[PDB]
From TrEMBL, chains A, B:
UniProt domain Cytochrome P460: residue ranges: 6-132
UniProt key word Iron: yes
Binding site for Zn(2+) 2: 66, 69
InterPro entries, A to Z: Cytochrome_P460, Cytochrome_P460_sp
Species whose genome carries this gene: Methylococcus capsulatus (strain ATCC 33009 / NCIMB 11132 / Bath)
GO molecular function, one term: metal ion binding
Protein name: Cytochrome c
Length: 136, 136
């Protein structure tokens, strides 16, 4: 019933990025430069296939610094993790939701079984609760 | 003596990202959100080894739109490509430098055999002409 730390996620397929700046409704706590990653099973889902159990999506959130008309990556703030298990995570739509502070396996963040995460992701029911779209 | 189009680069290792905003000295043509990718060979060099022949670094440059304090990736502007061949690219320090407009193999951007690219990358001679640092 716990989401595994997605060991090796930095070697996975980079789906997309986005910057959330001060003023954005999600600045707290989603502020920063984020990178979405997908394991092979998650790519099958993202391509328009179905998500197999064992699909993992990671959102990797960095602080950034302003550096002369450049936003430069600073320290990692956290990672968000969605792990597909249709039966074990059925209460949250077949994805298990976890956060790791600074991306550290020992800093698990979620305290409500992921109901808060799922509450926002539920808007994306028709893309199987995933916001990110595969781009070329 | 032409750099090959790096087919499949989107499936490679994501090294790092950066945003270059308007007013940056390199705004033309490096303005946008960029993602650096490395093939397996290039990872050896980034980890502290010698870059082997066949190492390829790609910088993938997107337009973005500031939409309510989110920077949102738009169309791809171009890719920059560095291809390691100590002998074939000896005039430019063993890297071949090329750009592909909109990331399309038929839109080559470099017109000076990469001397302009090399002129700036030469400052990084001590890190084998590569600016990007591997981060976890
Ligand atoms: C709305 C108020 C959200 C809440 C609460 C949570 N997330 Fe979410 N997440 C949200 C958006 C708008 C996006 C897309 C970002 C983009 O660049 O397009 C995401 C994305 C993720 C991802 C990546 C997969 C995807 O659905 O695109 C993961 C792995 C993820 N978020 C995890 C996650 C967790 C663990 C949360 C609770 C701790 C959480 N999110 C809440 C919107 C919102
Ligand atoms: C200085 C005036 C530059 C010129 C001219 C060119 N490049 Fe360069 N490039 C520059 C910097 C500061 C960076 C690092 C960006 C980052 O996020 O840290 C880069 C990076 C690249 C890369 C990625 C590999 C690396 O060295 O980090 C590639 C593949 C690359 N640049 C290609 C490229 C080409 C093809 C150029 C001539 C058309 C070229 N660059 C010019 C600085 C400068
Ligand atoms: Zn200025």
């Amino acid at each position: 019933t716990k989401v595994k730390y997605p060991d090796g996620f930095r070697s996975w397929y980079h789906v997309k990025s986005m910057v959330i700046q001060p003023g954005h409704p999600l600045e707290n706590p989603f502020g920063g430069i984020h990178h979405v990653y997908a394991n092979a099973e998650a790519i099958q889902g993202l391509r328009g296939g179905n998500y197999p159990d064992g699909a993992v999506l990671v959102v990797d959130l960095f602080d950034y610094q302003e550096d002369n008309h450049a936003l430069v990556e600073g320290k990692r703030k956290l990672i968000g993790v969605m792990e597909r298990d249709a039966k074990r995570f059925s209460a949250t739509g077949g994805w298990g939701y976890e956060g790791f502070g600074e991306g550290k396996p020992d800093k698990r963040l979620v305290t409500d079984g992921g109901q808060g995460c799922f509450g926002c992701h539920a808007a994306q029911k028709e893309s199987q609760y995933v916001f990110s779209r595969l781009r070329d």
